[PDB]
Design brief:
part of a larger assembly; 4 chains; A mainly beta (about 110); B mainly beta (about 110); C alpha+beta (about 220); D alpha+beta (about 675); C: alpha+beta; two-stranded antiparallel sheet; D: about 675 residues; Dna-directed Rna Polymerase Ii 140kd Polypeptide, Chain: B, domain 3; 18 helices; binds zinc ion; nucleotidyltransferase (chain D); zinc-finger (chain D); phosphoprotein (chain D); hydrolase (chain D); zinc (chain D)
């Protein structure tokens, strides 16, 4: 799923097929450095696009003076009783009115939806 | 250890003259070049530009044993001078000015 | 022994060097190195949990700088030299980089006062004049005109329309050097006036443009 | 324009070395004198602004310069000489300026010259008439904007208009496109869209990997670290993969320069000229605001990478597109940045014709004389023409110029005069039916009057600015850069591209100038310096967006500001001690300036106004309760300062229907008084 760079000329390693041992070989097209593939899959295309933005929001958003705050929902990892919540603010806005939270305690940065 | 328990004091001088201009020769760490493999080197200004401005051409271990091209940095003393600090047998420090910065890169 | 030959001694010695960044004002203080060139003392204190390096100015040079150590990782640095005898030498590899910074000795307001002092030459300004400066003088003969007069009076470019035989020799000689000369030079090489030159030339040769504006006369070999 | 912007133009001009011997000429210093009129017999006398109106004169001031001339013939002597205070031309003078005859006079003397003590000033007198310059709107420069043209081949587009610090007549613009997905073809259906670029001064489109290699960086591990800042992102790397496939066969520098060098304003017949031609166009016309020197080409690579990294974020749907009419992307051209633009094209035109007079006069080898070379009618009649007639161009250029500037002052009633010296103008057409450049935008709060606009065909095209709105004048970014480097900011060159994922890129005036690893302490250190005015002047804006993880700083001229009240934890910073000593300005010398320099008010730009939380009134919004917010950062002075000049004479304007307030503001301009 990732990418492979050549170890000699630092370029993009293409996948190739050899008719001897039935194993995927990654080859270069400037030099001919070789090696075998460990996962033996090339292409993947996610159309659902249901990526949870809990992996994209940053912990320093709790320094924003223009975001609402809450005393109801406390943090689990530290027990702080003050959070700051917001919406998806991104694409995939068909049914996007969820409410992600971020703890505001210094050096906690814990994030969670509900 | 002495890196934690070592204390010392040494004199610093900045000589108004030198017998040779001092430059920086920079390598990418990612290459991890073994300088021991450098039996010899040749070093000449690059010929594409056909002097002090000329990029360097470094030929190590023969004409094609190893070859790099060095490209001059935009500035070196535009706001702050760079100094080479060297330890002397008397323990005192000697400082040398950096004349230029050349960027060296590997060459297929 | 060759010009393009690089000494590898330093590298092969694994010679190490140190790299330090220094502010210009300090560096300007350093161009005034005390005596032949001594600028002070460097104090290196290392402890179990910390390490401190600083440099102190020579008392002469004066008339605490903590060091910030910088990483040299990602790029291998070495020092190479050019002697006053133009010999080339590699002194070493850089084992440390560092930056001299202020500490508890200055704040932003007086740093800006120092920046204004450095200003020295402000970018120029449009000043306000009083009344109006004189613009038109009363010169009689323009200075440029007076200079040409002496040249023309002293030397005349085209002189006597005389000595036809004498002129031909002067004329034939130029041709030996070149089959083709533009007309003006022909006029210039002799001093004979234009009309005589044309008639002698018309008499002894023909003139050819060669379709390149400038026409140079060529003698008839016949 | 007349203290700095005119001295820089003559000082930063190429000498005219010309030739045997050869000569030198260079200009050093500029002077001016008070406006003066030359009588019929050649006796000068200062003209007062009243005679200029009666006798149909023009109110202008003469202009001088110092020129030095050195002859270089290596004739065993370098003969230099100078002619100081040489006459050049005459510049109009705006009334009540620092260069007028009415500067700093008292009412007993203003009445003695038959002048009105209430006259505001700020207009020119040209052939008896009274002309006023209209501020023109303009799209902001040196920033990246991402749009989406839903009609053409492109699925996304970026733009960056660059100009190197007030020194270029044109402004080079560069696009970074991306082709459409639904390209009907059995070939590219599989690979996908290819990122393209349309450089200036070339005919054909160019793939981006090619123009990347023309700067060096031939490897594809080094290119793909200027464009992608973290290699744990497979979704983005998949999108840049089909960009390499078409630039795969051309894999070295010199052949790349030939590829772009083959299609220019002149197709190169030889090879070396193309490799020469492609060298400067990619060096002096590509992104001139970053650096124009032939060195420091690692910066032109990072910025071109950031321009492309930002184009992909707009395709994965991670950041929203830019708004065209968002009033934080606009700049205003006052009389300063307008006359300076017109003075360049007439100083070059004055040097272009000292050569033509020197060469004709030095081939005969006689000598040289410069007082006869300067055609003084170039600058005098050049400015006076375009101001008097309006078309912002040249006399033989009455077809290529922008019209509508410099109209005649309105003197029907005293509130029709003030409402003329404060007026903007958006340069879009006067009959286009597109509504989005005409409707009222949210960002006009407090900086443009919402009710005052004319009807007819010019609805929403001309606008008047509010009462306390203040336009900035400009400054040099030199003293902030020297402070930033000593506050632990890593430069771009001496850093590894893997230490860039968790750092906040620091921009200054449009140029990427480093990174930083602890921004929240940098920010509230930059601010408390501006509050008390040590290093940074009060008209710079400093934006920080937490999410996109960067920091912007601006110092240029054209941004529009307005003062607000600074609020600490939940209380105002304006204590009573400031009031009982502010009602005494008459014999205390304590005024507005001593109020800014004490950190209780602050000018807030439009861009900075998106990272702020305002309260509309102290006694009512800053009381602890079950409250709306609790982190108020600023407070308004009085919400009645959001109205213009002609709309703030209406009693109880918050009780009328809205179109009614628009009619009167366009009707109190024609009432007799
Ligand atoms: Zn390879
Ligand atoms: Zn927490």
């Amino acid at each position: 799923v990732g990418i492979r760079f050549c170890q000699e000329c630092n370029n993009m390693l293409y996948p190739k097929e050899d008719k001897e041992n039935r194993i995927l070989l990654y080859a270069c097209r400037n030099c001919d450095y070789q090696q075998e593939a460990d996962n033996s899959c090339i292409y993947v295309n996610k159309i659902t696009h249901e990526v949870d933005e809990l992996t994209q929001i940053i912990a320093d958003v709790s320094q924003d003076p223009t975001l609402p705050r809450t005393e109801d929902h406390p943090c689990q990892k530290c027990g702080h009783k003050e959070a700051v919540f917001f919406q998806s603010h991104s694409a995939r806005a068909e049914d996007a009115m969820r409410l992600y939270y971020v703890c505001t305690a210094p050096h906690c940065g814990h994030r969670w939806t509900e | 250890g002495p890196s934690s328990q070592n204390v010392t004091e040494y004199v610093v001088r900045v000589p108004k003259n030198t017998t040779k201009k001092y430059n920086i020769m920079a390598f990418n760490a990612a290459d991890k070049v073994n300088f021991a493999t450098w039996n010899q080197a040749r070093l000449e200004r690059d010929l594409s530009n056909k002097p002090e401005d000329q990029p360097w051409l470094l030929r190590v271990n023969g004409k094609s044993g190893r070859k790099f091209k060095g490209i001059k940095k935009g500035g070196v003393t535009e706001n702050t001078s760079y100094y080479i600090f060297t330890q002397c047998p008397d323990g005192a420090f000697e400082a040398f000015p950096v004349h230029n910065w050349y960027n060296f890169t590997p060459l297929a | 022994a060759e010009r393009g030959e690089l000494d590898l001694t330093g590298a092969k010695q694994n010679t190490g060097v140190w790299l330090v960044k220094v502010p210009k004002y300090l560096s300007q203080q350093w161009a005034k190195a005390s005596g032949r060139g001594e600028v002070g003392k460097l104090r290196i204190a290392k402890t179990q949990g910390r390490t401190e390096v600083s440099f102190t100015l020579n008392e002469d040079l004066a008339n605490e700088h903590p060091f910030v150590l910088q990483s040299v990782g990602g790029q291998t640095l070495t020092v190479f030299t050019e002697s006053s005898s133009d010999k080339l030498s590699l002194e070493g590899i850089v084992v440390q980089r560092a930056e001299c910074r202020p500490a508890a000795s200055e704040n932003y307001m007086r740093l800006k006062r120092l920046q204004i002092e450095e200003s020295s030459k402000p970018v120029r300004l449009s000043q306000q004049l009083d009344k109006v400066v004189t613009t038109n003088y009363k010169p009689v003969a323009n200075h440029q005109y007076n200079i040409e007069y002496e040249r023309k009076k002293k030397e005349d470019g085209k002189r006597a329309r005389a000595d036809k035989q004498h002129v031909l020799d002067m004329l034939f000689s130029a041709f030996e050097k070149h089959q083709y000369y533009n007309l003006k030079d022909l006029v210039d090489i002799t001093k004979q006036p234009v009309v005589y030159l044309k008639e002698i030339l018309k008499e002894i040769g023909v003139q050819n443009v060669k379709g390149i504006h400038k026409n140079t006369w060529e003698l008839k070999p016949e | 324009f007349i203290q700095m912007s005119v001295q820089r133009i003559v000082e930063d001009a190429p000498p005219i070395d010309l030739q045997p011997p050869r000569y030198l000429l260079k200009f050093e210093q500029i002077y001016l004198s008070k406006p003066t009129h030359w009588e019929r017999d050649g006796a000068p006398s200062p003209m007062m602004p009243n005679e200029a109106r009666l006798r149909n004169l023009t109110y202008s001031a003469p202009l001088y310069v110092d020129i030095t001339k050195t002859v270089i013939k290596e004739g065993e002597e370098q003969l230099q000489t100078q002619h100081q205070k040489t006459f050049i031309g005459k510049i109009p003078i705006m009334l009540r300026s620092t260069y007028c005859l009415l500067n700093g006079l008292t009412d007993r003397d203003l009445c003695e010259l038959n002048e009105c003590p209430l006259d505001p000033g700020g207009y020119f007198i040209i052939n008896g008439s009274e002309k006023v310059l209209i501020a023109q709107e303009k799209m902001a420069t040196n920033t990246v904007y991402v749009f989406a043209k839903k009609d053409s081949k492109y699925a996304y587009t970026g733009e960056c208009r660059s100009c190197l610090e007030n020194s270029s007549r044109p402004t080079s613009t560069i696009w970074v496109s991306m082709l459409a997905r639904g390209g009907q073809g059995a070939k590219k259906s599989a690979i996908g869209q290819r990122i393209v670029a349309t450089l200036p001064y070339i005919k054909q489109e160019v793939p981006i990997i090619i123009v990347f290699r023309a700067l060096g960086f031939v490897s594809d591990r080094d290119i793909l670290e200027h464009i992608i800042y973290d290699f744990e992102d497979p979704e983005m790397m998949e999108m840049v993969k089909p960009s390499l496939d078409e630039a795969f066969v051309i894999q070295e520098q010199n052949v790349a320069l030939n590829f772009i060098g083959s299609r220019g304003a002149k197709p190169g017949v030889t090879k070396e000229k193309r490799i020469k031609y492609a060298k400067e166009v990619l060096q002096k016309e590509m992104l001139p605001h970053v650096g124009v020197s032939d060195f420091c080409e690692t910066k032109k690579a990072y910025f071109l990478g950031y321009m492309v990294h930002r184009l992909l974020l707009a395709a994965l749907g991670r950041r929203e597109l830019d708004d065209r009419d968002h009033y934080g992307n606009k700049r205003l051209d006052l009389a300063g940045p307008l006359l300076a633009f017109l003075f360049r094209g007439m100083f070059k035109n004055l040097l272009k014709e000292v050569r033509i007079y020197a060469q004709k006069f030095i081939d005969r080898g006689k000598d040289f004389n410069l007082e006869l070379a300067i055609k003084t009618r170039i600058i005098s009649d050049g400015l006076k023409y375009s101001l008097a007639t309006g078309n912002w161009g040249d006399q033989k250029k009455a077809h290529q110029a922008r019209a509508g500037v410099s109209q005649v002052l309105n003197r029907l009633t005293f509130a029709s005069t003030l409402s003329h010296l404060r007026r903007l103008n958006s340069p879009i057409g006067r009959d286009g039916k597109l509504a989005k450049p005409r409707q009222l935008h949210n960002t006009l709060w407090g900086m443009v009057c919402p009710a005052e606009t004319p009807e007819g065909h010019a609805v929403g095209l001309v606008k008047n600015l509010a009462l306390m709105a203040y336009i900035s004048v400009g400054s040099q970014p030199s003293p902030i850069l020297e402070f930033l480097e000593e506050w632990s900011m890593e430069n771009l060159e001496e850093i590894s591209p893997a230490a860039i994922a968790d750092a906040t890129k620091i921009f200054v005036n449009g140029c990427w100038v480093g990174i930083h690893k602890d921004p929240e302490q940098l920010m509230n250190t930059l601010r408390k310096l501006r509050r008390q005015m040590d290093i940074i002047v009060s008209e710079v804006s400093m934006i920080r967006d937490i999410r996109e993880r960067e920091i912007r700083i601006y110092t240029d001229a054209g941004r529009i500001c307005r003062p607000l009240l600074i609020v600490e934890k939940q209380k105002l910073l304006l204590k009573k001690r400031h009031i009982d000593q502010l009602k005494e300005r008459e014999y205390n010398n304590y005024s507005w300036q001593d109020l800014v320099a004490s950190g209780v008010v602050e000018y807030i730009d439009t861009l900075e106004e998106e990272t702020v939380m305002l309260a509309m009134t102290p006694d009512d919004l800053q009381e602890k309760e079950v409250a709306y917010c609790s982190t108020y950062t600023h407070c308004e002075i009085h919400p009645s300062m959001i109205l213009g000049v002609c709309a703030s004479i209406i009693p109880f304007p918050d009780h009328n229907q809205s179109p009614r307030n628009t009619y009167q503001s366009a009707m109190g301009k024609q009432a007799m008084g």
